[PDB]
Amino acid sequence: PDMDTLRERLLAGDRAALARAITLARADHRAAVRDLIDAVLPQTGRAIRVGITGVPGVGKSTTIDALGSLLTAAGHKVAVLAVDPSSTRRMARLAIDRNAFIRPSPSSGTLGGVAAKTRETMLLCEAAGFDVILVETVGVGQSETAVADLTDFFLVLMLPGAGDELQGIKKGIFELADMIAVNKADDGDGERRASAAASEYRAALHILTPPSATWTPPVVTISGLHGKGLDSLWSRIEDHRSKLTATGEIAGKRREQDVKWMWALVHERLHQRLVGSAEVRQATAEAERAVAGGEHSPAAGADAIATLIGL
Amino acid sequence: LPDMDTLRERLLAGDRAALARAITLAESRRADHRAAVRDLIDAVLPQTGRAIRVGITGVPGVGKSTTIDALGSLLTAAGHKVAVLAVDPSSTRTRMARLAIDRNAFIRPSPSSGTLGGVAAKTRETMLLCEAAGFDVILVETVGVGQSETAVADLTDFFLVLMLPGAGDELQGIKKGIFELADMIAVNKADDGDGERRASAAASEYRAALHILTPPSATWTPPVVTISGLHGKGLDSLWSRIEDHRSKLTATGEIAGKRREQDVKWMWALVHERLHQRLVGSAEVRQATAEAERAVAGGEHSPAAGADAIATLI
Ligand SMILES: Nc1nc2c(ncn2[C@@H]2O[C@H](COP(=O)(O)OP(=O)(O)O)[C@@H](O)[C@H]2O)c(=O)[nH]1
Numbered sequence: 001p002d003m004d005t006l007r008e009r010l011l012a013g014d015r016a017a018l019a020r021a022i023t024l025a026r027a028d029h030r031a032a033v034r035d036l037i038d039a040v041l042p043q044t045g046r047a048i049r050v051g052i053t054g055v056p057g058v059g060k061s062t063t064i065d066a067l068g069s070l071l072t073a074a075g076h077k078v079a080v081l082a083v084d085p086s087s088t089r090r091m092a093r094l095a096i097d098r099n100a101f102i103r104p105s106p107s108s109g110t111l112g113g114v115a116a117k118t119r120e121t122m123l124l125c126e127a128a129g130f131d132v133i134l135v136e137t138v139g140v141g142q143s144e145t146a147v148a149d150l151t152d153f154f155l156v157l158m159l160p161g162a163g164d165e166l167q168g169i170k171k172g173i174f175e176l177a178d179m180i181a182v183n184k185a186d187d188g189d190g191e192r193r194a195s196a197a198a199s200e201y202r203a204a205l206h207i208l209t210p211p212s213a214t215w216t217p218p219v220v221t222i223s224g225l226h227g228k229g230l231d232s233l234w235s236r237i238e239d240h241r242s243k244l245t246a247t248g249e250i251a252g253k254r255r256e257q258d259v260k261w262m263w264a265l266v267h268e269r270l271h272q273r274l275v276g277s278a279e280v281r282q283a284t285a286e287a288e289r290a291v292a293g294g295e296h297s298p299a300a301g302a303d304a305i306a307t308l309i310g311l
Numbered sequence: 312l313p314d315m316d317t318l319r320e321r322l323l324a325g326d327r328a329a330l331a332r333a334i335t336l337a338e339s340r341r342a343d344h345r346a347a348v349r350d351l352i353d354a355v356l357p358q359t360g361r362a363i364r365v366g367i368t369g370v371p372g373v374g375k376s377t378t379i380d381a382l383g384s385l386l387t388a389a390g391h392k393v394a395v396l397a398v399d400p401s402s403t404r405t406r407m408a409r410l411a412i413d414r415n416a417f418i419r420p421s422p423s424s425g426t427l428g429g430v431a432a433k434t435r436e437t438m439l440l441c442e443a444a445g446f447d448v449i450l451v452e453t454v455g456v457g458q459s460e461t462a463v464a465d466l467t468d469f470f471l472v473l474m475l476p477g478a479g480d481e482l483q484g485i486k487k488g489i490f491e492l493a494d495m496i497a498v499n500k501a502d503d504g505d506g507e508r509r510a511s512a513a514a515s516e517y518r519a520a521l522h523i524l525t526p527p528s529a530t531w532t533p534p535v536v537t538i539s540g541l542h543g544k545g546l547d548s549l550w551s552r553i554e555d556h557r558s559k560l561t562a563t564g565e566i567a568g569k570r571r572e573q574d575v576k577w578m579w580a581l582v583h584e585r586l587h588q589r590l591v592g593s594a595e596v597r598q599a600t601a602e603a604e605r606a607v608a609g610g611e612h613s614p615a616a617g618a619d620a621i622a623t624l625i
């Protein structure tokens with residue numbers, strides 16, 4: 001409590017109020033903050049939402065720290081969030097940045113739950129006046145698609161070498177990308193290496209059909225460590241925002257995303273009621289085991305689960 | 312209902328009439344009929360799974376019906392029994408001429424359900440019945456408009472994408488989401504002469520891009536091939552590549568592993584379809600569900616508030 005004061009404080013720009021709200025996001029504490037979000041929904045959405053991914057070691061934290069510091073220096077308020085699978089189990093300079101709000105990936109039993117708390121945290125930050133939301137993720141199962149469905153622009157960071165030199169990435173990320181940035185383009189030979197690799201990705205991306213006629217994903221080279229190409233990278237993100245806002249496509253994407261998250265939440269309530277209940281959790285596991293083990297057909301397993309939903 | 316023990320025998324004996332009967336019973340409006348079929352399937356489960364399951368997709372007009380008709384006919388001539396199953400999202404609302412007359416083929420349209428998940432899950436059950444009846448090749452095709460590509464990929468062992476022969480400025484391009492699903496790209500309409508030169512030119516562009524974009528050392532590297540479904544070119548080679556995939560991924564256990572993941576997916580799909588039935592069961596709940604979706608879609612209420620409203624209705 002009390003939720004009327006918290007809201008007025010949040011909308012004013014109060015960091016402790018944002019912190020408090022985020023903390024709430026206990027079942028009755030969860031629910032209180034959801035009514036708050038519905039109430040400030042009209043003051044959300046005035047932010048550029050960017051998803052960022054890439055292989056461990058590519059330079060995500062380094063690049064985020066460098067870009068976020070450029071952005072705060074230019075007068076933005078930057079929220080840096082995360083969707084990390086490891087949360088179900090240091091960007092040093094941005095931390096000291098009072099105009100940045102870093103939040104580690106929230107704890108939750110499922111990746112759906114991690115995704116759900118992050119989307120909540122994002123709307124809270126927007127209501128609090130943050131105008132850039134960066135969402136960091138790693139390529140684990142479904143997290144990349146989840147983050148691409150949470151943001152306006154999905155940035156994929158790549159090591160400076162394609163084809164035979166690729167490792168540790170899921171193929172589909174090239175289709176989620178609104179831009180590929182090849183990192184480690186350090187003065188000298190790094191520039192040549194990264195540029196060679198960018199030219200290959202550029203040639204390859206030509207076979208993938210862009211989802212919008214309004215935007216053809218660029219391939220750029222950057223050095224997050226040495227601060228090369230970062231302003232040009234951001235300029236492309238701003239270009240995308242401008243062009244797709246003009247056609248109504250940012251709004252359009254956001255609406256689709258919202259209805260997707262609505263249905264995903266319904267299925268999430270359902271599942272964790274079946275998995276939480278000391279009454280039916282074992283029966284649910286037994287049905288999944290019978291199906292996965294080929295003892296009973298998928299439909300037979302669904303039949304057993306139906307009875308548990310009865311009760 | 313008929314005697315289900317006789318029906319089971321006839322099905323396992325490979326009787327095509329029994330298969331169609333079991334399918335008709337699955338499509339019945341009576342729940343008690345649909346239940347009998349579910350029990351039959353559980354009973355014949357140990358006799359299922361000895362088939363190559365292939366998903367096939369491509370844009371309308373690429374020549375999918377023609378290619379399936381041709382390939383299906385080669386396979387039945389080679390001693391196989393072939394089922395062709397469609398998956399179409401318009402099954403949730405509201406022509407292969409030679410194979411249609413082939414006694415060793417079994418063709419069925421997309422089953423009705425409330426959700427695409429439901430349609431696909433009912434397709435998996437149909438696939439099990441076909442396999443129990445001795446069908447050793449199951450072709451599952453996407454039909455109409457819709458994004459049923461993922462559903463068809465998650466129903467099968469191998470996902471084949473058919474593409475148009477355009478090259479250079481006329482290259483078709485791979486649609487978003489298909490690149491990560493494709494186990495092979497076949498450029499169709501490689502007719503003798505100009506057509507096959509365009510198809511080979513397109514294949515070379517796809518092959519070069521795929522090399523750049525595909526991390527090495529996967530068990531299987533998706534090939535790019537050219538075919539003509541209409542003139543019967545490249546189909547035996549295309550099939551040998553699918554048999555190669557089966558061998559390689561059977562040896563690593565990857566085919567069994569994927570089928571396990573899929574089966575659990577389809578179980579949960581059926582659970583969700585049943586809860587969707589609840590939300591569209593009467594005019595009043597249908598309208599309430601629509602109003603929740605419209606509120607979230609219009610920015611008036613948050614996703615969580617819409618989800619609250621839905622959960623309540625059930
Ligand atoms: N040479 C070079 N090294 C970099 C660059 N960006 C990051 N690194 C280094 O790459 C390693 C991984 O960086 P980090 O940001 O932690 O990677 P992350 O796991 O993707 O978040 C560290 O040693 C970084 O200092 C760059 O642009 N050039």
Ligand SMILES: Nc1nc2c(ncn2[C@@H]2O[C@H](COP(=O)(O)OP(=O)(O)O)[C@@H](O)[C@H]2O)c(=O)[nH]1
Nearest residue numbers: 370371372373374375376377500539540541542
């Ligand atoms: N020239 C040529 N035409 C083809 C080939 N395969 C299919 N077609 C034609 O392309 C049109 C669409 O074929 P269809 O099989 O119905 O395509 P679908 O909509 O993808 O199922 C028809 O006129 C076919 O005759 C081919 O290999 N060569």
